[PDB]
């Protein structure tokens, strides 16, 4: 669905409050983006569906670490 | 069997590509019936107005006695061969000799 595959950002719900504080139910959607990554360990290009915060996690720790944690969650990469 | 002065012009640079064309222009006419009667290359010389932004076009004169229909097909080449730039085929009385 609309799930960050690295970080797990489920689309949450919320109240939309206008200037007169009239509540209307709305949905918060993450900044999901499909990305093609390069791993020199597999030496190829993988396809993930991540968010920008997830992209910064890919920047900070190694992609070989995030891939093994994704395999620890038993997910698909 | 009519006699036409075919006067056409080519680019300045493509005077390397003029002559063999006349030879297949020879094959335009004497292949069917056509007698070529003059060949006077006036060559590259200077223009009173730059058609397609260039002076000095290549004038080629060629006189022929020929059937009309190969001359119709010759104009279907003169339209679409993109080297020849200005080309008129006038009808005359006889096939002539001198410059």
């Amino acid at each position: 669905s609309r799930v960050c595959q690295v970080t797990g950002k489920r689309p949450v719900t919320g109240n939309n409050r206008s200037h007169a504080l009239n509540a209307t139910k709305r949905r918060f959607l993450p900044n999901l983006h499909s990305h093609r990554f390069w791993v020199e360990s597999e030496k190829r290009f993988v396809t993930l569906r991540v968010s920008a915060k997830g992209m910064r996690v890919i920047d900070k720790k190694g992609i070989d670490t995030v891939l093994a944690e994704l395999r620890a969650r038993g997910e698909k990469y | 069997m009519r006699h036409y002065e075919i006067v056409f012009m080519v680019h300045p640079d493509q005077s390397e590509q003029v002559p063999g064309m006349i030879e297949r222009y020879t094959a335009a006419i004497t292949g069917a019936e056509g007698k070529i009667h003059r060949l006077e290359d006036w060559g590259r010389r200077q223009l009173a107005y730059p058609i397609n932004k260039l002076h000095k076009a290549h004038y080629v004169l060629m006189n022929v006695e020929a059937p009309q229909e190969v001359i119709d097909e010759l104009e279907t080449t003169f339209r679409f061969n993109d080297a020849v730039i200005r080309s008129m085929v006038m009808r005359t009385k006889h096939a002539v000799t001198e410059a």
Partner: protein, 149 residues
């Protein structure tokens, strides 16, 4: 996110300098093409002695081997003899795959991605120059004169 570097560099680097740059330039072009490493607090341990003194001069003598790859063809010319049109305006436009076959026939075995045609796709029959990306700095001087059949 800074860098630790592998080649010399096109612009921002000199084989062993760390420059903080935009991370899109890290992810799209620096990392997967094989020219940079994000240095990640332990690749500085990789690059202090184990790479900057042994992989650097190996990279530079491989650069001399790319210069040798330019020296593979002794002639630095080609004359492709594809079929062409009647007095100019060639039959089909000759290709980078076809010029790849015509240079690996006798001479350089360069990659087709390392073939550059600076004068378009050579839509006239005449004198043109093609160059080969043997390196980021030095190039080949191949002269092409296609002939109509």
């Amino acid at each position: 996110m800074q860098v630790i570097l592998l080649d010399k560099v096109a612009n921002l680097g000199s084989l062993g300098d760390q420059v903080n740059v935009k991370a899109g330039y890290a992810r799209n072009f620096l990392v997967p093409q094989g020219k940079a490493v994000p240095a990640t607090k332990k690749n500085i341990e990789f690059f202090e002695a184990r790479r900057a003194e042994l992989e650097a001069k190996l990279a530079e003598v491989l650069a001399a081997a790319n210069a040798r790859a330019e020296k593979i063809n002794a002639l630095e010319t080609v004359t492709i003899a594809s079929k062409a049109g009647d007095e100019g305006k060639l039959f089909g436009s000759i290709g980078t795959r076809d010029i790849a076959d015509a240079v690996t026939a006798a001479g350089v075995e360069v990659a087709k991605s390392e073939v550059r045609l600076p004068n378009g796709v050579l839509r006239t029959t005449g004198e043109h120059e093609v160059s080969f990306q043997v390196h980021s700095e030095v190039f080949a001087k191949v002269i092409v004169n296609v002939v109509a059949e």
